[model samples]
Target: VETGAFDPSKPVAISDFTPKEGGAYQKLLIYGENFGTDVSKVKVKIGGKDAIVINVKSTYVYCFVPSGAFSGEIEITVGEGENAVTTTASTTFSYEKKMVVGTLCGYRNNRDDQGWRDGPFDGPEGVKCCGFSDNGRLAFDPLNKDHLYICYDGHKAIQLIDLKNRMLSSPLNINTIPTNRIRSIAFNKKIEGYADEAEYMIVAIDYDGKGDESPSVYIIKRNADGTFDDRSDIQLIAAYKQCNGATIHPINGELYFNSYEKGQVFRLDLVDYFKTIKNGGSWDPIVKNNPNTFKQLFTIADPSWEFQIFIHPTGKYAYFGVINNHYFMRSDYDEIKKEFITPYNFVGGYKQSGYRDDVGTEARMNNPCQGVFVKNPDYTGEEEYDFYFVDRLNFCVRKVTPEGIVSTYAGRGASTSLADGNQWGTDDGDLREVARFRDVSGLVYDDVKEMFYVHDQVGHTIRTISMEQEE
Candidate 1:
């Protein structure tokens, strides 16, 4: 903390502040004259919120915008009481609350009591609220932004979080599915004969220690009112040794999933599958006989570490993570052929297990899990979307740019792995500095509300990352 000596008789003034408009935790450079170098003697506040003053020099101040800071004049104070000399910037610092990690639902009272609790999201520390017990994966309904589907490996079956009413409910009972390990989920935007377009969900009910079933995929239909018809409409579409995550091609309307036993990616044309089993009869023949029904699209390097594969909404490219290897890969997608070409190391190194915010394969990621893509309004080209992924081992959410650049998006956990990343737990606040996550293996973004839900598995909670602006 270098503090420049200040002349008490002289006055302080603000000349310029680069990046006059931005959001929380964004670097702010303040320039002026006669600002004292005494760190403790200098204080700066943006929009009435105390902005962290990193260092003070005779001509400039280096600081960060406060979280939830509204648009207001920049106030710089030197000294205190009657001896204090103050200056306000000629221009106000426009502040917008960027992405902040906050709690959705989980146990804060007794960690021992954490389980599949269904209720309203209104309680002390979200204790009496709804939550998931084991590993939870989620997907947002593209047609209904007010609905979010949660899949957990324990306590059985899928859970629904109604964003409109802030309530959590278990639509299909665990016993109804007969499987405890439903690892991944994906939403269907449209179904051919359904009364409503967004009335179905796909789940990869993978193998579990206690469950008697093998890796199987099923489609659960919802009534016109959006209530899951766990009985009449339930149907199994595919079965295998082991599976992990499921994804749907945005433009092609084809469903895809991963094989946990191998490095294979499988695709299932939903419309074709449904049409073959038109009467909702058993698909044992279609799955066991039709060779092309559950076809292998391509192969990656992750043998037993494959987790998820996500295709971009534009249908041009996609990404997948090799869980144990601690890296993610990208593949070019062919729109006409509807196939994913060979994958290349997009960001992190294949076997490297460290945290580095660099570019391309030179960077490192730890147990990179499920991720989502958000379109950047600033770009108009094919690579206009930014990918946000959660690092289970690093315990932080990371952002990858269109140019294969990576940075910490939220949850500034320990830079170096410590205590197996147990040090990162369910603490939420500012995206970078004040937030922490534990074993965040899954994440989803809702473009309608512009929010992100993080599946903090070890933390025993579902955390939310959303934008805010002070009124």
Candidate 2:
């Protein structure tokens, strides 16, 4: 009936709390009753530390969990002085300390573990048979979290994996095309329509022929039934002889890719292009006759090879790994020119000289392949958006911060041979010291789950890296 009055009959109670585990200062939703409207009189404690209460009502309290809070009970106190009533919820909140890297799905038998139950490498001749082999690259369906497409270069096909059921779909034969060697795969999110009603377009590069001569780019559209329509395959570009990797701009919907032999990168504006093709425009004439349709972003001089390209979530920059020079480069978007600024060696130096895990240009990489940037949704000031890449020669995943600090994020000793020194296995552990890889060639980050799917080429498995609560 009055301020600082505690009613024993209406004691505070907590029904539940969401996101039981998170970092310090993470916002937590507590559901309960009898939390009075007096904000200054209410106190919230997470792991014994006082939380900054922002609001208070009869049924809920809004606040930022105290910084430096650890894993422990959440205590809520209402009223003040002798009238204060404290209540501890049965549930506890845990603080996550490090990212956990492990195998999401893959056989431990190494190369002997073929992913498909039946197919070309095995038996039966129908759509029900397919498998994964020497998996080189993979792309997730932007609209469907349950679907993933992978390139089986050794098997000469592209196969889809159902993450929801952990099943592999029938292989989409790439060997049927003139340029049959599949090198890279990417999904386009630039198409018009709703997520469920949308027709997803997947782009892939074929590494055949010679330098800038006969390599090709193919597009596959996904059907409503979750199956890819092979008839929709369109060879968008065919002049490049050694195209290696491809990625779609999340916002602009443009396509960007690289050529290993030519040591160059290029961009294609597909918004109007796709519109024309859908409206009965010819695919070959539009791409072939207009050879200048694709714009060259930049080129590296005299390099043996380059790898896949990854765009930052913010769409402000794009990053790629140059193998021969062992350098990771960045291309910034020039808003005024509406073009990418000339690519420059942002990290790593010439001839693997700057290969160690250090700050800025002092860091070095050994045969770096593909890289993806981490997204910070909470906007925590302490966490910077960092770039994670596969160090192929070193057999580990390394992290490079926006400020250019580099360090090993996963894997241990380098695997010199398929059967030697490779710490490959289906085990989960801290990536900084124990996680392993063998010729890891491809990587795709799932922003929705904050998990990374890695293609361990020589290891012949798809491994996952994610953050887990520390025990």
Candidate 3:
């Protein structure tokens, strides 16, 4: 027997409240205008753990957190009838630490209908088409605070739009610089020649008139007013046709990326370049590689090598996804690499890569795609943070705990069930998960918004989700 003027037709939302000091044990406060007085019970859950709620008033309720979970979000149920709601509340809580996360959808110009145009190249039609009509790169700018920057293949241009302010900047020109068919974008707040701390940095991988096309990453420096600098800040860091992904390392302040063809990950130490300049040495790319080497973190060869990489905010660990593959790997720099010695007596034709393999397990993903990281109060350890990924084909968002457990937040198609073995929904959920996406590629987190920004190549739109708070 729920109460006064509680319109069932009106939308009900959820509000989540975590501990101020931020260790799990987070509480939740649900507020709605017409919540009935006869409501029997209210429950809030983090992952599978339940939070205890004490009814504060007819329109308000409070919960006492029991335990913590990674990537914490609350699911609110009003009574024994099982009516519940979900909302994004991370920004409302006043959490200090923030990280921006984004994802690329694999829809390209040839197939996608969005206002995509071709790149400035002469090649067979639809074979070597340029422009992001099919695919777009997604990232956020700290300067704007709440907007996202999208670079599309169709336009061969980068456009800035504020998600909060609802402002759209004129498309900035990056003519002939080749960001067409871009895979990933990274932000370098500070760089050489530009000392005032540019707000945004961008990179793209184009064929550049070659057979085995490795992507060339670049930096798009922004003016104080949120516009691109007149001249190019683009610098060539590494040349790999198999360039599948790129991101700035959260802890080390270095640029790290992955190779799709070789199934390898590399780290570049920019601090070494400054050291060389301090010693009055010339800036040579070849000489730099001599000491600043690329290390292969994984040796497994992947077929469609779409590796989605993410660096944690605390700079504790790195996360990656292999599309159309079942396995994912994480490297903990703080822990010692475990080594296994192969005895000469054991002649089983074993081939071992240089780096040690830790906690090898199946990621349980079909068409596994678009991996990202989320920083919330539930993430406890230094090297440990809450990890998120999308199964593009499945159209569901999956959350991975620090202990490496996988659970579904939302599913493909469209049913909502918390049952252990329930088929959540139809491809509709998938459609919504990637509605703005052509095909899911890579994703990064925005610590500020607590919202997930997804790039849709097909729609040529960047979709976002935020935790909704009640009245």
Candidate 4:
């Protein structure tokens, strides 16, 4: 589709650019001459790093500043590599760090070919870690900000990350029994040596009586060095099977998860459960037959498929999303009653599986998975937070505003019938329209870093969305 090249006599000339004071992901227009319509032949670099050129014309070029760009000249190169016409803007361009969605590691330049190996971010095989199975989740060590935990689906094993070093390591691997059926994992400890909200992680075994233990909620401790211990203390063996998520209340830190079979959102015990650890990890109940290790706080509107629950950091409200059902049910927590009341549809169309960024239920998603709450600095309202969830099959992440409006946050999903095609891959750049992810879940956040770490289940990579902190 090469119509023509620039006039030979009229060489590329530097002109001017608008809005010299913008940051990454912000649209920029550089007005110049001799930039042909062929976008692929045009290369743009802002602050020395290459930016993504959207389109080009003889008069102007449109692109977005890439992450890590600094204040420098707007450089543009057109035509072929050897005989290209390069030019720069008359006025220097400056960058203010802004919210950006980019890959932290584990995606190769090769499209769609996900290899299973451990190495660098753009390594030959990609960063091999979790997401081998459909059931895995990630969490940051509250004790050590430099460390993060990404579990290996149903096992005691994990693939850990050293954020400061940008490296991945794992615990001593030994499969003693069947893997725990985990989808959402929660963090509790921050200081040291297991005191309330320190040094403990709660997971569940939600199978039909397999492995060394019955269906129950188990507790794992974070070792002294901050890596999670493979050993676990049996917390509670209630008859809750096919359970999916585990969330700790921000106010009380009691562990919570959901039952896929009966749509029950149960809150399991902890302080009392921790007390029994001394008495041979067993206790004498008043009734002697009481199996009340947890309280059924509330059930979702409809949770036939898989489900995961989350409490906003303020504990002001709670929300649960059902996978394959395309819905998220939300409710306001009643502080006095100690339970979430009157669950309602936050945003979803019942069984109306498709991708649409509309208002309320008019918007839709496929394979709605785990979600995270982010404090929105711009919102000057009572609920000053936003909810973001991943559509696993849709291959995109969607955000729910405080007003309950839905919009695509990242990636152009491949298809609606859950069929794959041209749109999905590991392409990373300006996230909303250009970035692509194969299939993702494992949604977790590091507040101090202002980044969300997502596990690309099918793509077999780790992706991140980062925001510049605002004071």
Candidate 5:
């Protein structure tokens, strides 16, 4: 090995070789100049984690490309002085389905504090906690399978999980996200004319803030190698407000979000917003506050549509649900004028004054806070969708149909004091005994599997219900 003066500016030349097919031996040989005495201590990293120390006699580092080799990069580092010489050695490799779901952060149930469970489960298992903090949000690019990202609000960091390797590679610790409580995430592939290749962007919302007024939202860009682009690329969307959920419209590519207050629905046309920001050089609230640019699609005045807002699969109809609020009252002048009315009232009907507030708390007949779309199987224009009212107080899933029919989905009580004549003794109001949730916050349906992934944030487990049976 030839020894030479080391320059921090230039890294020693290195070439990596990966097998085109199955192979046991893969070589990454450091070439050019300067191996020196420290060359024996030189270490190489493959895919950012694995490290191998090189021996003096061996100029080439040899390792098995064990299975997950669809495509990956390798880095070589020579430690000397205070700084380590680092350089990218190679790119492009292949791998099979090596991503394994490793850690199971046992479900955490929070019903006791929320006030439903009288005591622990009657079974021998006692009380158990289930539910991972899905606060950071999960995003997997529908097009690019490799682009999987998860933001860890607890750590105030965002990690890119290699789907193939099933490992988190680049963890960008965004200390700026005031509290580690991200609630939702959004990414856009194209913004104005910003090359599609440069189109990776992220938006995250938080549930709590350290000192700020409302929950926060953070935005960042993903670099080509699946790391945060840079701090400068980060943007803060909403601060000092409670944002509950976010969704990107697949058909039109717009982003819509609802605050916990359920009063207003904010819309952001990502394509237009980014175009304005890119050319304007920086994000400006005044310019971005263009009413023309952001549409306040609907309002939750009657207290029902306030909890959850969901866009239909076709993107034509926006489905909004009101949780444990009073039943819909068409007698209200504005409600009739706007034609924005819920189909039916809760158990109290419309006769009782303050029924919204009374039943909302007593029966836990709160507004429908979470919703998931169930495509009409018969292709009927009737457009049917299902939503769950968390009913934190009563502990039940109130299922409503588009025609204003209210029934019980999954819960315990067969008939309550507020139950209308239509619900008692019927299968609709009797489902509470089977469901395991106190507060269901969000619902998402997998069209392919026909399964409903219900987000029970307050209760803590993502309940999957088969939508095949029953209406």
Candidate 6:
């Protein structure tokens, strides 16, 4: 292996390769000099497995890393036997080993006092603990993983939590509207044009009863420095009868949310609205007056209240969880028409009564809320299923497979009172069948950590669910 040598007839020097790590069949571009026109003689091996060479040039080569190649060094060679010349880049390629196990952190009876403190004491010990009230939701910053935002039903402001340090900040009051409850919060993934200023925009919905001040969606721009912009100029982009749940589109940056009182889901073309504002278009009347035309996705039947809606990572479908009606529904997007197809129940029968884990339509869900799709680390192609949801009435976390098989993944105990089930306990080794949850209202899955964070409303604690290790 010669270093810093030159030769046109043989492989001499290789500079580097793009993407330091990738899986099997993943393309890798190699930059080097002295690669000959006879591509047949050029060969590349990753972890000793021969790679499929796609193209070759004197200074670069395009190849697909071979299957079954482990994470290690890459080797490239030219010619054969005695006349052969080989060179390897200093960097190595890696194959990621998927995570299959996960774990949940807190429980009702097992509240770690180390991280527990009452949030601006309300009345007494039982009334309010840690500043949390009924019907709370959690939002994680896509750009800043260490920060978490929580919004509650009766609380007048949103609370910020530092996940890394395990500390909570004083409640952040909504400017001007001092006594409104924030029902839901969704953060837009980083947008391109705003990279220099704010990396993302946070949309929050208030759940006040129908009135001039009731049910408005507010925007808070997140600065690049990890701080939020002043809410004094924060805009009210839309209004509804009673906004309960909201989520930002993964790709388009649009906002899709539902109103509990109106029983309807709507989509706000935020990209267009933000563009208009950047062009100096009028914002006051457009935002305050709800002039930005929102597309009505669909309406749910009365007696049913819509909760959180999660958009698929591919942006092709959205899964919505509803209470009272007890159904998990799906709405598909028609790319060509640029509209949402009629929504239908993906799992659980319509108005399904009782709580029973079964197969597909045969299963029953009682007041399910906040559905999230769990990433299948072993997924290869378009398997658009594997959803985890909180069954509020059932007081358990459930999982639904791509094949529509429903099963109780955790929380098996039945409690007479909302606070009786799944309250404080810490036995990571305990069987999930023996675990319990007291009125789990919200759930969020962390793809990076391979765990589920659940908010037990009556329990007044944030709990996690993870996989067990192999014995």
TM-score list, all predictions: 0.81, 0.68, 0.57, 0.77, 0.48, 0.66
Q: Could you arrange the candidates by TM-score from highest to lowest?
A: 1, 4, 2, 6, 3, 5
lDDT ranking of the models: 1, 4, 2, 6, 3, 5
All models: lDDT? Answer: 0.76, 0.67, 0.48, 0.67, 0.45, 0.65
Higher TM-score: candidate 2 or 3?
Answer: 2
Least accurate 10 contiguous residues by lDDT in model 5: 97-106
Q: Write the per-residue lDDT of candidate 4 for residues 91-145, one digit (tens) a residue.
A: 7777787554566666433454453444434333434432243445777777676
Write candidate 6's Cα lDDT for 1-471 as tens digits. Answer: 244233435555679888778765578888878776557878888877788899887777899876456655788887677768888878777664322212222223345332345432233444333534367777776766666677777766666666675655644667654346666777765556643223544555654554644546777765445676353356666765566766777766667776676567777766666777899996442222553367776675563365667777877877777666777777787776555677777778787677778887789988887778887767777874578888887777789887778888777532322344443332222224235666777777778867767777766667666543323
lDDT of 2 by residue, 10-63 (tens): 788888887778765578888887787778878898877789888786778787
Candidate whose TM-score is highest: 1
Highest lDDT model number: 1
Of 4 and 5, the candidate ahead on TM-score is 4
Badly placed stretches (over 4 Å) of model 5 are: 1-105, 108-174, 187-217, 223-233, 238-242, 258-262, 286-299, 302-306, 322-364, 382-398, 413-435, 467-471
Question: Residues 1-471, candidate 5, lDDT per residue (tens digit)?
Answer: 233545456555555453533321244343433333454556655544454444433235444443233334556666656656766755544322221111111244244332212122122223322323333244555446454545443545555544354333435666665566555555564544663532545554545343324534455665656455344356665443555556666455666665554445666666665676768765543312456655555555543233334555555445444433433321111222222233223233332222132232233244344444566565566555544443433344555554445555555433432353222111221133223444445444455655444444444434445522211
lDDT of 3 by residue, 76-154 (tens): 5554444543333343332222222122222234444433333222334443323434445567665555556666544
Which parts of model 1 have CA positions greater than 4 angstroms off? 1-45, 51-65, 71-92, 110-116, 125-127, 174-176, 189-196, 208-215, 229-232, 279-282, 285-288, 413-423
Summed over model 3, clashes come to 42
